[PDB]
Amino acid sequence: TVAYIAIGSNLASPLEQVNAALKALGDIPESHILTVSSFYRTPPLGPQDQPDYLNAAVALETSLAPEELLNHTQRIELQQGRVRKAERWGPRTLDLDIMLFGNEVINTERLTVPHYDMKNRGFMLWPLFEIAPELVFPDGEMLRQILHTRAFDKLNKW
Ligand SMILES: Nc1nc2ncc(COP(=O)(O)OP(=O)(O)O)nc2c(=O)[nH]1
């Protein structure tokens, strides 16, 4: 199954974390990275907060069940990032979000797939569009269309 995972890091120098996360993702059992988008520097979704994020999208081939994949992404979040105390927006330094899991729709207490807000987030959509420009969401929405319509600022590469 191809899962699309968004990586966000709000570290000032996120490359090493992102690389650790990518390695970690590549190490998830039953999985392997198909493609990694470029790394993009994106303005934080919250206030300015300050920290730009590095955002990237990863296409991960996996035979894992989505909740099993989520276990691994959450593990990697815990292992490779930490919590920003008191931060309401982006408390984690490293977010790994399953954006899409194959063509599955998942609406469980643990997991909302497609990612519950990705259609509002250029920082998720543009990297994904880089690696999956033709992507069609389970409901038939098209990634390209969402971008076309919402006119999300293009992202600068990190
Ligand atoms: N530019 C940018 N801004 C961001 N703001 C918040 C989060 C994650 O915020 P969080 O409080 O964890 O909430 P959620 O992941 O549920 O949207 N991620 C980004 C990101 O990846 N890129």
UniProtKB/Swiss-Prot annotation:
Q: Which SUPFAM superfamilies match?
A: 6-hydroxymethyl-7,8-dihydropterin pyrophosphokinase, HPPK
Query: What Enzyme Commission number(s) apply to this enzyme?
Result: 2.7.6.3
| GO biological process terms, semicolon-separated | folic acid biosynthetic process; tetrahydrofolate biosynthetic process
Pathway assignment reads: Cofactor biosynthesis; tetrahydrofolate biosynthesis; 2-amino-4-hydroxy-6-hydroxymethyl-7,8-dihydropteridine diphosphate from 7,8-dihydroneopterin triphosphate: step 4/4
Taxonomic superkingdom? Bacteria
Q: Does the keyword Kinase apply?
A: yes
* Functional summary from the UniProt entry: Catalyzes the transfer of pyrophosphate from adenosine triphosphate (ATP) to 6-hydroxymethyl-7,8-dihydropterin, an enzymatic step in folate biosynthesis pathway.
NCBIfam families for the chain: folK, PRK10239.1
Family membership: Belongs to the HPPK family.
- According to UniProt, the name of this protein is 2-amino-4-hydroxy-6-hydroxymethyldihydropteridine pyrophosphokinase
